[PDB]
Amino acid sequence: MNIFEMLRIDEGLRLKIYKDTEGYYTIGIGHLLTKSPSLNAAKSELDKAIGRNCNGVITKDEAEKLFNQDVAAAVRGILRNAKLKPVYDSLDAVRRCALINMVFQMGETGVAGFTNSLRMLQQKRWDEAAVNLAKSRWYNQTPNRAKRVITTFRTGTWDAYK
Ligand SMILES: [Cl-]
Ligand SMILES: [Cl-]
Ligand SMILES: [K+]
Ligand code: NA
């Protein structure tokens, strides 16, 4: 298991524009297009992202390309963030994937606001961190996914994805 396989499980793969769990137009493997309620705006974002007139439809290779870019952007985001980078650097390879997963889903700024959870993770207080992480809108809105990510943080294993 690796970050690509992990996020592929959590995000799915859909080749037509669809609405994510927040009601936002998305495509591929969790590629957020826009928060605009306009499908035309989402179609314009898609064509810009792919570099052709897609009419709301892409290929798997195109989906995978956006996914590679988006995973990299999540990791870049962490490394450039003053609150996330020290936690990331303190973690093992498996728990780093849990943090990347959270940033992929909710963005750099949003995960950086989990100040108390991040401190617990830095302190390697894994059970305490797991408890704190669940006291969140994130957990309540996407509980099965949050439970998987939280188990990854608690254990440093892939048991929730195996
Ligand atoms: Cl709560
Ligand atoms: Cl869920
Ligand atoms: K297609
Ligand atoms: Na999704």
From Swiss-Prot:
GO CC list: host cell cytoplasm
Effect of T26H: Facilitates transglycosylation more effectively than hydrolysis; covalently bound substrate
GO biological processes: cell wall macromolecule catabolic process; defense response to bacterium; peptidoglycan catabolic process; viral release from host cell by cytolysis
Catalytic activities: Hydrolysis of (1->4)-beta-linkages between N-acetylmuramic acid and N-acetyl-D-glucosamine residues in a peptidoglycan and between N-acetyl-D-glucosamine residues in chitodextrins
Pfam family for this entry, one: Phage_lysozyme
KW Cell division (keyword) present: no
Assigned EC number: 3.2.1.17
Residues the entry annotates as binding substrate: L32, F104, S117, N132
Effect on the protein of changing S117F: 10-fold decrease in enzymatic activity
Subcellular location: Host cytoplasm
GO MF assignments: lysozyme activity
Family matches, as InterPro entries: Endolysin_T4_type, Glyco_hydro_24, Lysozyme-like_dom_sf, Lysozyme_dom_sf, Phage_lysozyme-like, T4-type_lysozyme
Alphabetized UniProt keyword annotations: Antimicrobial, Bacteriolytic enzyme, Cytolysis, Glycosidase, Host cell lysis by virus, Host cytoplasm, Hydrolase, Viral release from host cell
Domain of life per record: Viruses
Field pH dependence: Optimum pH is 7.3.
Protein name: Endolysin
Species of origin: Enterobacteria phage T4
The organism's taxonomic lineage, starting at the top: Viruses, Duplodnaviria, Heunggongvirae, Uroviricota, Caudoviricetes
